[PDB]
Amino acid sequence: TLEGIKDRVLYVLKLYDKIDPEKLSVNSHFMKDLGLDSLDQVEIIMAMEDEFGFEIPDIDAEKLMCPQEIVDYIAD
Amino acid sequence: RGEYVVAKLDDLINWARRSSLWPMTFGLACCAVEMMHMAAPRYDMDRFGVVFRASPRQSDVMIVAGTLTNKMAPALRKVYDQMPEPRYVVSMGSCANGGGYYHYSYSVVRGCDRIVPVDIYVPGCPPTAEALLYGILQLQKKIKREKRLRIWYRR
Amino acid sequence: ASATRFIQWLRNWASGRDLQAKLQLRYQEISKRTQPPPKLPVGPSHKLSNNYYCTRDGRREAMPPSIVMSSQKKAVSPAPPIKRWELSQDEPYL
Amino acid sequence: TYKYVNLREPSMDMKSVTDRAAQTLLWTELIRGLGMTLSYLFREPATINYPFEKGPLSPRFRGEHALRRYPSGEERCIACKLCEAVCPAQAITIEAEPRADGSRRTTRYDIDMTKCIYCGFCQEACPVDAIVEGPNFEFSTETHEELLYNKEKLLNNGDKWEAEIAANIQADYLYR
Amino acid sequence: TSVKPIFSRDMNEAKRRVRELYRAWYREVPNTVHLFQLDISVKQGRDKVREMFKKNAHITDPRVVDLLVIKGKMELEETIKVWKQRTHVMRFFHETEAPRPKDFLSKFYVGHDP
Amino acid sequence: MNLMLALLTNFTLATLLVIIAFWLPQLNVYSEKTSPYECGFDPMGSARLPFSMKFFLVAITFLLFDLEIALLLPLPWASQTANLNTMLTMALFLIILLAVSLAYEWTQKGLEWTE
Amino acid sequence: LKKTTGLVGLAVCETPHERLKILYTKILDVLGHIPKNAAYRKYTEQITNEKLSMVKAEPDVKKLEERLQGGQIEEVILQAENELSLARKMIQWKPWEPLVEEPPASQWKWPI
Amino acid sequence: TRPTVRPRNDVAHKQLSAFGEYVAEILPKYVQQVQVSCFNELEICIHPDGVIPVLTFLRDHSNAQFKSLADLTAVDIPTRQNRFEIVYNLLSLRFNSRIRVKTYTDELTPIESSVPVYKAANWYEREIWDMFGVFFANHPDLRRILTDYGFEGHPFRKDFPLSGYVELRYDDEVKRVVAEPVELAQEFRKFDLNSPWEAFPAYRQPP
């Protein structure tokens, strides 16, 4: 359910306190938009692993820098 | 007279406690060998009512017989804390007393009184079995001087 | 040493040994605690002549290791093979 | 030469097989072990009646430290610091200066008895028999601080124990 | 400048190992707080984990990074198997240590240490 | 009534001694004292975790053999019967079958503990 | 035949002469793949042939152990297995090649 | 005939020299130096790449048979660019002989684990890693073995202070043992003992 997949992914972002829900969009870049660094990205990816329930090997995770890229990856 | 009664009752409980001292089966290094010699036939600590028991729940005295390292320090504190009260500690030998010949070591606690309170300090490296037996008898006389019920009475 | 005859027989019989001849408690067979003074001997270097230290100086005879090969025919072993041990004639089997 | 501790072939004749059958069923080797502890029950025990009786020691015994004097009462110690240098545990601390007269004497002489290993190197190193380990081994204390001996405590030990100490040195000095 | 590697041929392989260790520590903090019965919260444990990774963020030598990851993994195995005790886990928090000043004047008053 | 009085007295005295033991001594309770014992280091996992039984087969056999003694206990009374031919046969029949089952479990390695 | 070798875990060999001929022969074949001038090949062929000559000359197992001077015959067989394993590993290691690298200037200078 | 002087054994010296070059002839790819001491001990100095080939050869070769690893340890020499020297002491029961094999490494270069050759090496290599920080590759289980859990540093390094950086005590406020920066009521007294006169001319180094 691609629509819901976006719904759940953005649900996680809103909780990650360092991410201000005011400035977030499905196309924001974690580095140059929210101001997070690498280990924040690792924490964000680990949240999506919990919420969806499947492994994201480090090779795949280090490309997911936008919420949409996570949405697209989730589909696959 | 309450004063007379509590005075006598201290004698009773003090006599019972010093006459039935059960040390924890606890030894660390060299000095534990002299402790074994104090249990041996020549001195026979058991003839004083001093009986080794392994469980801290059933022990009254911790004889710290040997070097206390930093790695062993939490374990020694754990088994001391698990002793029911009243409980006493005898520090045996230079290592336990103040670090001894590993005093300047990076891995050695410089005296077991940094970790537990100590009632009697027995000097030597190692103290002879008789020197330890003298230390145990000195602890007995210390217990004989306790004034728990007299102090309770006057509170 | 003070045990009565009957107890001596009882404990000798029980252990199967003659215990009285090899008592584990010490009595008068041990040395006196006051002894005559010693007069200890002297070593071989106690001489008034022919005793120059340079001729008996062990430390100064130690040499740096001999370099066999530096990175600057019959096969051998480190030593001959060890001779096989022999059974004790004293008591080969315990 | 070597020997075998456990390399036996047991006999298979009827007598030997029955002797082992009786042993298994009648516990003969277990009864033999009871006899040996029974024989100890009737032996005189090795316990001594401490503190009324004491374990034997020799003149060489290494016990509590003491600082000695000459017969005139002058201190033997000359603050040479050889004992401090050799001490394996670094348990000795010394300071010295010229006394009010011209004498070379210590102003500090400490032994941390909780650092000391009672090895006796200090009395071996001393050239004037000033520092000795005495025969006393019954000086356990209730506090740690009581085992940090300063010069006053050690001089008192020598004055307290000299009568025994001098006799012990007299018995052993020809072995030194 | 040719040397024998430990695990990583270059810094990009090394950072992959660093990220993996961070995940293992991140997942472990909730269990460590539970097993050892710590009075800190999971956020505090994870903040401390993050702090320890950031003190080394300036390394550029893959062999040095490989060793820090190696040591970090032994550190983690000690915690998971409860070879550590509560005292060892709490040594990371320096609770009994008083705060040493960092400004000049405070150092000047207390003593001579720079 | 004698028996119930004896049982009541025995367990009452035991309960009284426990009550004295808990109310007479001076208590000093804190977390580290009452923590579980395991030789100085904190236990690894709970003590309620499963503990493998390697003699599980012997324990089940104990059930079947324990009922045999219930069947054999009446034998002293059974020896008073006039019909001694029948009882002796049946008494021996039961014991032999008990012996047979032991032999069967022994030979099949039921008495050896699992690894 | 002996009842035991006396060493725990070392079983008695029924046919020690046959086993020793097979193992030494295998060693020699493996050595044939090492370069001719490699010292390991030259020395190991030399000692392996010497033992093989003793195995053929002496049929008595007690007397053979006396010649080989290497313990029980079962210890000799085990050693031949060890050598055969070593020869196979030496082919892949190739330690007859020149020194891989000189040490730093004073790596082995003691005292400093 | 000199009561105080240790006698020489030139037979053993000769035998060890011959074997030392025998090993150098068979393992030229690795052996960097062979020496025999005046008290008759043979040392083989090898390139670290040759730890497994050299130890395997000494164990398995029919003229070696060093079946026992007596000791495995490290020495720290800070003045060397490869500060750590790894020392293997082996014993051959068959030939009643001992041999020492030595190699080198630094703080960042791994040494191959010799557990495949000697299972005795498992704990010896953990001790070297623990006390010196030398990493052994392909070790089945490399972790501290002697130092306290979570201990930081490698105490046997020459630049590690004798008393370390932290000490322990029990703190009543937190009800646990705590670690704190080390303070000594009496500082260890450094002694300068070396005499300024040369003792052994035989070991003098060129100026």
Ligand SMILES: CCCCCCCCCCCCCCCCCC(=O)OC[C@H](COP(=O)(O)OCCN)OC(=O)CCCCCCCCCCCCCCCCC
């Ligand atoms: C005419 C027709 C008549 C018909 C009847 C005739 C039959 C008579 C002969 C029958 C045999 C009599 C003995 C039977 C008793 C049981 C014997 C027994 O089972 O002992 C053997 C047992 C096994 O041990 P083990 O040798 O290791 O194993 C054997 C092979 N698996 O080993 C053991 O049990 C050892 C036990 C170890 C613990 C012993 C500790 C105490 C020892 C001292 C006890 C002394 C006994 C005192 C008894 C007090 C009496 C109230």
Ligand code: SF4
């Ligand atoms: S005090 Fe002496 S005898 Fe006792 S443990 Fe320490 S070194 Fe060993």
Ligand code: SF4
């Ligand atoms: S006995 Fe040994 S450790 Fe003690 S003060 Fe003398 S030299 Fe130092």
Ligand code: SF4
């Ligand atoms: S006690 Fe003896 S060795 Fe020590 S300083 Fe005095 S004279 Fe010198």
